[PDB]
């Protein structure tokens, strides 16, 4: 009777920005892991460690789910062993990973005529990102020896900048929605795995 609310994650009108991504714990389920492929046309489906057939057989305790929105070309940056702008200051992926990544186009829903300036991303930072933490606070960023005054002038920046979307760009710059699944090593008795 109790199935994981995968519909809630997959069907949500508003998606979180890249620098503040959602994490949702999943426990005490029997969940159709095979419903995804026939759920809706998905442009990309790539996972690591375990082949698609062994998900409903092997049995896990807890599940982690994340979701955000990125432009088209930077899908490849979400993978172990890769570096870049997002991979270093926005969302860092650890060396080991047993989850899957699903990315699908959502060009029609969000990008209206005027555009979407709600989404944001971070460009400047002082050091690399540790694996698996989340940041929301934003403040002045200085690039000079002199301490920053209240006014950000000629040496002080605004670290955050937004996107702009129109229906008539090319294929590569159209928006995409990304959902990352994850798994965790266990010592408590398992609770979430496939139906019979």
């Amino acid at each position, epitope marked *: 009777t109790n199935l994981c609310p995968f519909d809630e994650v997959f069907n949500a009108t508003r998606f979180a920005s890249v620098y503040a991504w959602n994490r949702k714990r999943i426990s005490n389920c029997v969940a159709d892991y095979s419903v995804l492929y026939n759920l809706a046309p998905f442009f990309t489906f790539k996972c690591y460690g375990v082949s698609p057939t062994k998900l409903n057989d092997l049995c896990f305790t807890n599940v982690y789910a994340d979701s955000f929105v990125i432009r088209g*070309d*930077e899908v*490849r940056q979400i993978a172990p062993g890769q*570096t*870049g*702008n997002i991979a*270093d*200051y926005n969302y860092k992926l650890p060396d080991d990973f047993t989850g899957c990544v699903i990315a699908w186009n959502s060009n029609k829903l969000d990008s209206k005529v005027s555009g979407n300036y709600n989404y944001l991303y971070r*460009l*400047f*930072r*002082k*050091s*690399n990102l540790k694996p698996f933490e989340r940041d929301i606070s934003t403040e002045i960023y200085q*690039a*000079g*020896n002199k301490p920053c005054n209240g006014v950000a002038g*000629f040496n002080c*920046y605004f670290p955050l*900048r937004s996107y702009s979307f129109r229906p008539t*760009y*090319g*294929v*590569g*710059h159209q928006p995409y929605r990304v959902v990352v699944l994850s798994f965790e090593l266990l010592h408590a008795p398992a609770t979430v795995c496939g139906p019979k």
Partner: antibody
Amino acid sequence: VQLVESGGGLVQPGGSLRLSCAASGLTVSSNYMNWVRQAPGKGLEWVSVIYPGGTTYYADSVKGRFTISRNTLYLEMNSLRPEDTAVYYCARPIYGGNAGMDVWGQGTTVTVSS
Amino acid sequence: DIQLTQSPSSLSASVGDRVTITCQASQDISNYLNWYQQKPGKAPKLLIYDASNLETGVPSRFSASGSGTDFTFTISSLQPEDIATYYCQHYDDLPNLPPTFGGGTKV
């Protein structure tokens, strides 16, 4: 703001060389330093760039042979090929929407003689 | 990757006549456009940094506005003191496309 460069001159092929783009008055620790070279009577080129964190991206021609070191900026050579000469430039290119980013060096020289 | 070509470089004309330069793109760039005005013997200085928007600090004697993958830049009139060479530039460092410089035109 101001940038200063030094070093460069006679050298033999097969022997490395060291370029000291010693910056003054600019925080080299956290800035997108960039290297671009201007061939004689030809178009400009791009060589390498550095992020505030440890990260290096290289152009096609200079394959695994250049090294950039982060209050000074350093560049090093390795088995300098015959097809390499002309002026080099330390750049801090514009990033973001603010105005006034771009600052450039004066110049340098290099030649393979004997 | 992206390959850039430009209008005929050797352009010389009398004062008061607009001069037009065209920059073309190969792999669908989007408004990633700079115009590095340059002078012989000196390092280039930024003049146009994001498509239509102009750098503040220079009198508005240059007409530049566009989008897509083909861009145009125009000078309403060329004073003798303003003779120089102008380049085209796509700024980025992402792994997909590296930055490149154009052929360059001498006015």
